[PDB]
Design a binder for this molecule. Structure first.
Ligand SMILES: CC(=O)N[C@@H]1[C@@H](O)[C@H](O[C@@H]2O[C@H](CO)[C@H](O)[C@H](O)[C@H]2O)[C@@H](CO)O[C@@H]1O
Ligand SMILES: CC(=O)N[C@@H]1[C@@H](O)[C@H](O[C@@H]2O[C@H](CO)[C@H](O)[C@H](O)[C@H]2O)[C@@H](CO)O[C@@H]1O
Lengths: 134, 134
């Protein structure tokens, strides 16, 4: 019952990836992963409403050759269960820049040194409705 | 590179898939495949500018267990190299409905009797700019 999975995205540095999806009404959290494949994620975007001991906190992390890196938590939380949320992601060799529904944007280190993002996957709590490449 | 590949779409009857992309300036043909998986397609949407003996011909077909079905060809070709083109495909139990860039619509029988579309793949000279699922 997982979410949408996309491969061969070929997102290049500077390109803006816009993803709009519906957060499940009973979601305790949701995930949007970006990277080379399921075991190599340059970005594990994980807004947690009430999950894993956290409340209303965005947790980001990287996964390299299967290994999870050091998590980074964001300063804001412009998300709510049972609503449509859109995030905009771009990257360069040093960092990924993530823009949230509230227009707030932060950076997450590009720990995989990715020069292209070909994989994206959402979990069962984030129903992707639209994906744009600009 | 090649073409975007999305799985776990879970597109149900009555739902529409909108795909917008850029037709290569020297496009020969491009494909949008929809179905259960790569070897089971309810719709192989293949606009051929100049390929396989076809000149500006939209060729559609189904693929059952790897075997191509009986091709269907349309009477219009609203695609132009070097221009953005959008197609809207609606899935229904009896037929899939395709709405072309200029509003022309045609149907293609759901030969595989799919109850949902979970696979989408793009190939050829068409750079996807955005996809909307519902
Ligand atoms: C600050 C901290 O240690 N928080 C942790 C969460 O990171 C942790 O969630 C895990 O996160 C990793 C990414 O690092 C994987 O996504 C893993 O699947 C998650 O469970 C949770 C639960 O283990 O515990 C704390 O909140
Ligand atoms: C008029 C006719 O029957 N032509 C066919 C070609 O269209 C066909 O090419 C393949 O067509 C399928 C769709 O059925 C895919 O688009 C595939 O990529 C094409 O190569 C060829 C080969 O099967 O046979 C006839 O020429």
């Amino acid at each position: 019952a997982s979410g949408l999975v996309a491969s061969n995205l070929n997102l290049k540095p500077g390109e803006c990836l816009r993803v709009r999806g519906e957060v499940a009404p009973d979601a305790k959290s949701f995930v949007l992963n970006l990277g080379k494949d399921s075991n190599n994620l340059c970005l594990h975007f994980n807004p947690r409403f009430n999950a894993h001991g956290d409340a209303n906190t965005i947790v980001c992390n990287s996964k390299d050759d299967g290994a999870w890196g050091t998590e980074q938590r964001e300063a804001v939380f412009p998300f709510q269960p049972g609503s449509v949320a859109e995030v905009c992601i771009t990257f360069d060799q040093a960092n990924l820049t993530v823009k949230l529904p509230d227009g707030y944007e932060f950076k997450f280190p590009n720990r995989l040194n990715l020069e292209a993002i070909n994989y994206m996957a959402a979990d069962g709590d984030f129903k992707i409705k639209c994906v744009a490449f600009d």
